[PDB]
Amino acid sequence: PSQFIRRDIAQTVNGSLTLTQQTNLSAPLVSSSTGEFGGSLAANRTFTIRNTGAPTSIVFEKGPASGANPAQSMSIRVWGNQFGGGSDTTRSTVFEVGDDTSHHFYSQRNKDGNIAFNINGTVMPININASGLMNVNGTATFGRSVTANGEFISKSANAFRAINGDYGFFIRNDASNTYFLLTAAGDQTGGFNGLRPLLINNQSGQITIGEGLIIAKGVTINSGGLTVNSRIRSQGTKTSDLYTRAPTSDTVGFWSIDINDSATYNQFPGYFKMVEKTNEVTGLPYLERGEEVKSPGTLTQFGNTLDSLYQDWITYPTTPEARTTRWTRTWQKTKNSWSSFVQVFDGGNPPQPSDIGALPSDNATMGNLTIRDFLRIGNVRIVPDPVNKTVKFEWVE
Amino acid sequence: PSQFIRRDIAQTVNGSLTLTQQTNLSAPLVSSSTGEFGGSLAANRTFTIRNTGAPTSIVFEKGPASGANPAQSMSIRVWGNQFGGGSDTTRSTVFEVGDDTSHHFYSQRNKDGNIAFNINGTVMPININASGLMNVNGTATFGRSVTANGEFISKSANAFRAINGDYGFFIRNDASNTYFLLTAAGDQTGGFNGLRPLLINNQSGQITIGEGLIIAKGVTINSGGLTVNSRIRSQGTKTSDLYTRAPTSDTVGFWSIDINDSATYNQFPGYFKMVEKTNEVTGLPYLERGEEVKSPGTLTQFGNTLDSLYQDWITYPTTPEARTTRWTRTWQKTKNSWSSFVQVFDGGNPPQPSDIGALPSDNATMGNLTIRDFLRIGNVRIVPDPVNKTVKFEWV
Amino acid sequence: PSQFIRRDIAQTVNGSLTLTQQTNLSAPLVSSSTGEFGGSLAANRTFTIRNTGAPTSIVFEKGPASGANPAQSMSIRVWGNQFGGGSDTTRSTVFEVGDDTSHHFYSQRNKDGNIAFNINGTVMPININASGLMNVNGTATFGRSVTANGEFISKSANAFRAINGDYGFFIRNDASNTYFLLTAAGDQTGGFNGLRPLLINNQSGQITIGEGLIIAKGVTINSGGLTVNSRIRSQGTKTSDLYTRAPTSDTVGFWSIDINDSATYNQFPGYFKMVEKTNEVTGLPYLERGEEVKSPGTLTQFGNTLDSLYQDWITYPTTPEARTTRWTRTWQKTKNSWSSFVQVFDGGNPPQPSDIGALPSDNATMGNLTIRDFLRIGNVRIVPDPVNKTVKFEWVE
């Protein structure tokens, strides 16, 4: 009648067909319902998951817990919240991959049009090459060098540290001063010890070096002077020829030298032996200069130029009866020579009557003497007697 | 004939069927055409998108703009340009994910066989662990420490900066000199102010410290000497026992001490009062020594060693008629003592006849004198007369 | 009869049907077998790949090597090894994308529940924003500034380097000392040259500056003193008023000045041209002062305070007959004046009899003299003759 199906015209089948043989189609299959295949599936070029009100997804089933199967099912879901009316409408288009516990990753176009790729864990690339910015909130470690075309800036008080062997060296800006500091040995990442090698006042720029300073190749203080607690050893260059050496631009200035070798000090002036004499009349001692004796001594130079330069020589005693005598000379640029050392006159080295043209206090001899008022010999006074053009001899008493 | 579908052998059906009940299959479905399901679809194990000349893709539709739908449709496409597509041939195999506007990301293998994973925006992981290298073209910020097993190199003139509080401190290599510099207060990322704490010349390595230098625990200049503009205060260690103090390795050298306290300066030589007298005969004045007067003074030492060491003591006046006198002594290592201070003779402090063994210029007494030529008394010469065995007198 | 298909009840079919027109479904399609579509395919909302023991995948075919086709096929596979009984069972759930040669990338959740996203090559984002840690094993390069809230630490002996123009400057902790060093010109990334600008001893903190030091705005040594090899030029500030200038807190201390200009040196003491006289009886010479002659000289100051301050003036000869004479003075704080310069007495500049109140040895005149024992004139001794209350004459031969 029409309870059987036609091969030639359109037809509506109201019984469930089971097809036990291969079904072939050469025209569109259009269903308003589901498809289920117990074997594999293939289609040409494009698979489209259609959306009529809910986000689209692919589900990868986990299957039995055996072989190469995963522990959880996963999905790809394409969704957003721009149209959902929540407190957040900024997740405009999201491609999210995850399992039953949480997403693994997603890409997202924000409502602002920018794209994010979120990874819910650790990203493990080989190389990284980012065209834009980097931020990293946690600790960072690099296995090799780090080069920047810009500046390195630290907001940590301990800012820059170099660790090698037993010690950390570091630069610390504590807001008041910037310090160059060192760790205890074996505490290389830790705090500063008690050493204060160098600091810089952040306000004034003034530097304090706290554990001693050695300088090679000269020092010049341009301004402000120098204060020293509590001695200066200005050590002159000691040469065999100090007695005759012309100064140079390198040897001008202040220094002292200990001339302690006889080959040198024998060329220099000595001390003088002194004999303590007694004035017969008054009993007061006076020193009579005796023989010169060569001695070690200190040579001290002063003055800063090849014109302005002088020296002092101060003998020091090394034998039990040795005395000390000082001597002076001045550099004579126009003569290209040192003046001859002259003796300083002092209470240990007094000028002698013959040095100055003074009559000795006793046992004296002279060419001539003029007496205006009287000469007394023993108890006789000799006085002028001009009225008789002679002298009177007055026995006293 | 029969135009009815045989239930028993192979049948080509040439009208459109419309199946209202569940359709079961137990053998392959094989179509040369499209499929469209208005409900969900499932398959076992594997889904293959066949490629007969155009790249394969999955399209995820956006649907109506409501609920949890995305604003744009997305696609996964597997494509390349090694065999076509304009000028680039190096993108061999690309797995691209994106929306109607642009890709979000892709992986590719290039023609040389290397893999890139491109993200068209911000990658936001928790941790990063890269086995190879890193390049970042833009500014970088780190929330905690940054440790490198290698060196940190900056190609920026301002190279390394430590900011804390009001100030940035920084090292600047300007190509000529390397400077340690400071910002103005509250300009911590900015340029250097006028301070010049320290620079190093890049050619000579000579250092200039520009805002003063304090040093503790000693200074030694190994070579090249020292030049100072424009004074040196070498301040000796003032102790109560300076008069008797033996030098030590610490106190040898040059210094000066102001001995201003009588407890100490009373131990040292004073100045001498002096009275100007006039020689009656010549009219020429001379200074006659009187009482010693204790006085503050400057003690200055010279010499660098326990052998080579001497001192000067220069009194300074603190009362209106006070004079000034210098005194000297030498350290005597072998006797373990300072020599006694001796007075310096100078124009303000001349020797006296008593110091030198000389007769005073008048009112004098002596034991004996010998006169070779003549003794004149008033206007009479007393001379010897051999032809008489005595003296003779001669007027004028 | 039942050689045709019934159109109104359930019908098992055992022929192979070939449908040449569009097939329309309005109820589920349920197959135990495969599906293959030579055109495109679409479903609504969800696609599920079922798993009955082997991991699920999608395969994207490369097709012919033409147009916009890829060089290799790709797949997405969701798989694991937790259940496989192998030596690694930690890869619990893996979402893996790759081609015929290898994976490109994968996400996984491990057995510990943590997520990794592995990229088998170079990750190329625009920006990076990591909420956790960063480790990079290879070389790192940064195009702009690098700012850390924490400390920068290097474990490299050469730790921090600033390159500009021809030179690298760097800080090197070699485990013994920390050095500030410089490259040769044009070797900006290389080793140190021979320069030693600054180093810090890691154990003591002592600093050595090796290529000279200039300091401006003053130096103070708080402790430990100063040693200088091998001279000190303490250069006083030379003003026109040095003769009368009161000291100030800036000018106290030790210095020397070369007073080489007559406008200034004519205000200071001169030297004396000396005149040699000869004792008539001994033939021994003695010097006395001739004319004073103004001269350039060295002015040297000593002392540290406005109380404790003195000066020396040492003339230097600039002509044949010129001689060096020294002069001294003391700052008198309570009088607010320098003492008058007084002449130093020395061998070149001895005191005269008239300076000391001594009788001249030659050609002397005095008011009175008392002789106790004898006066001899030529060959006659005049002696006290107390027995005859006079004086006795005694010719001596």
Numbering used by the authors:
A (entry chain B), C (entry chain A): 893 to 1289
B (entry chain C): 893 to 1288
Sentences reproduced from the published study:
The proximal half-fiber is formed by a parallel homo-trimer of gp34. The protein is a highly intertwined trimer containing a 2 nm-wide triple β-helix domain interspersed with three wider domains in which each of the monomers forms an anti-parallel β-sheet. The long tail fibers recognize the outer membrane protein C (OmpC) or the lipopolysaccharide (LPS) of E. coli and are responsible for the initial and reversible attachment of the virion. The carboxy-terminal parts of gp34 that we crystallized occupy the part of the proximal tail fiber closest to gp35 (the “knee”).
Crystals belonging to two different space groups (P21 and R32) were obtained for gp34(894–1289). The obtained model was also refined against data collected to 2.0 Å resolution from a native crystal (i.e., not modified with selenomethionine) of the same crystal form (P21 space group), using the same test selection set for calculating the free R-factor selected in thin resolution shells. Here, the refined model contained the same protein residues as before, plus seven glycerol molecules and 1312 water molecules. Both the native and selenomethionine-modified models have good correspondence to the measured data and reasonable stereochemical parameters, although residues at the amino- and carboxy-termini have higher temperature factors and show some disorder.
